[PDB]
Design a protein around this ligand. Sequence first.
Ligand code: 5ZF
Ligand code: 5ZF
Lengths: 304, 304
Amino acid sequence: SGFRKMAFPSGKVEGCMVQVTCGTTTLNGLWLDDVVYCPRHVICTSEDMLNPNYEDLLIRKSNHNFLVQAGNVQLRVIGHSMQNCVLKLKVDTANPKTPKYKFVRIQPGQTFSVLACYNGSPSGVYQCAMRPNFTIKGSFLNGSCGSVGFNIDYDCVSFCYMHHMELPTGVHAGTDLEGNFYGPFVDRQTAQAAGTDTTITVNVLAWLYAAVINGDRWFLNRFTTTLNDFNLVAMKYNYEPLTQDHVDILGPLSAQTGIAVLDMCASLKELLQNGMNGRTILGSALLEDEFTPFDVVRQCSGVT
Amino acid sequence: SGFRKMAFPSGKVEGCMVQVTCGTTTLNGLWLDDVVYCPRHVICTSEDMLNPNYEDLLIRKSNHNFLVQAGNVQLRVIGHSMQNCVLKLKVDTANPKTPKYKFVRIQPGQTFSVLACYNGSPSGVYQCAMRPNFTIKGSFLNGSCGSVGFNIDYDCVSFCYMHHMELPTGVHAGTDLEGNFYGPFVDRQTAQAAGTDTTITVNVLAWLYAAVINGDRWFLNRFTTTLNDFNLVAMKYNYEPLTQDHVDILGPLSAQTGIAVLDMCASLKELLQNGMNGRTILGSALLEDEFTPFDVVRQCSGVT
Ligand SMILES: *[C@@H](Cl)C(=O)N(c1ccc(-c2ccccc2)cc1)[C@@H](C(=O)N[C@@H](C)c1ccccc1)c1cccnc1
Ligand SMILES: *[C@H](Cl)C(=O)N(c1ccc(-c2ccccc2)cc1)[C@@H](C(=O)N[C@@H](C)c1ccccc1)c1cccnc1
């Protein structure tokens, strides 16, 4: 019993964090095989934040301008390239602790674990969702850039996010491990705002199924609903539209609870139209949307 | 910016988790140097849950009745003893991945990280508080027993919790690493209640300081209060009484924000007396009490 914001174990990712310094700037890199990945803004200075020409700036740099440090050991940069918004530093030593890994581009509403790092040293781990507007609501200070987001399938670490910057709201933006930013953001000091963020409907439904599995059954109602009718109520409360793919994805929890998806949807509508009257579901006074149906199945089936 | 329930990196603890089997029962053990620690209930069977005489049960066991498995390696048990509610299995090989560690008995209201394990394999990591009533509100399934709670100071792992059981309300109970239970609980199937759990007042104040630091300031009011005055209101809402030591402990956040502690108390008082009016602080619709002043400082200063 119980339901917590649970991260994956971070050990495999800890062994891959290094410190990358270029001139004055210090930020975290990810060391896999004989390559270190980090944010390309590491090569900027203050004069160049409003509109850097990275191509130009990168040309003014040589291999020896990049100091890479893993623990106390200094690694030798024998190459450097830029892939979209990431710098790839080629080093003469493959990481002995390189896990089985993939790079994946995740979809909005999916979750991952963040290993928040400073000076190449892991500081903490937490679970995050990629918001519909392609930001993440993380917890990151100055120096956190290069910190990575990941999911672990058995032995394979799937890297899906690299932290690049904080926005005016205080939300965070970043890229996949191929340097492509999630959303419409750019690595420069300019006016950037995220779009309207919606609530991940399928995630709230999964969390409600988790509540039932944990005995919090009050919100359950005597009414059912239809996709069309629910989706009309959803648009009003800035909830993402629910698809049959979402209905199909929730099947495992429906079968374990004996509660059909559309009956769960009808209970959400009432919580949306009538509020929670001051009660709490799974310790929260608001509807949570950062848990996927998989996250819920995992935290209720005990996957290791 | 941002504020999340953040766990410590779990890598150091991952390398210490093993699988302990005695007869039919499998659970998790902690392998440090040449000793494996696990819950003594591993030696029990179904007929013996209501009132086991462990001394007696243990006498029916020899070294070879204990299977310890770390990954695929089977370790050889060369000794066994019982310390309070933990079994200590002596093995012939010291753990090569043993971190610098201590065993600590933590105070109520303190926090720690849990590495939830099944079959000796890490599954997930999350942050918990030891409740005033000496339970924890965790997320553990069958097979979780022997999973541990810890804090990491630099390279030093302080083990403070081993999971032993789930109580009727589905909160969890366990021991320190000397096998002394937190609270009045015993390792048998009897009826055990936690009694009244209060809110950790000092942690709520810390969290409020976290909010201010993150720009959430609506709840700040034009009042101050006194310790006595505040505590009279705290007792009414089952908040732990605030001491001068708690006041001293909040000094960093106080100095950082330039908001005096007693002024923050007066703001808590109104929130308690008036509720939050359906507003939120740091993405929550209720007052959070599972972050310590240290957790807050750490998350708002960048410790690794
Ligand atoms: C831990 Cl691997 C587990 O699956 N248990 C559990 C704990 C303790 C015992 C036990 C105690 C004394 C003698 C023999 C065996 C057995 C199983 C789960 C659990 O605590 N069930 C509770 C209801 C229980 C308490 C006391 C005795 C028996 C059962 C458990 C389940 C979920 C999360 N954590 C632990
Ligand atoms: C990352 Cl180590 C960091 O401390 N930054 C940061 C990000 C990006 C840049 C940058 C961008 C383009 C050219 C040069 C440098 C510098 C610093 C923090 C940050 O994002 N500050 C924001 C306001 C910023 C955005 C864009 C440009 C400059 C600054 C930061 C702070 C807190 C959490 N994460 C990141």
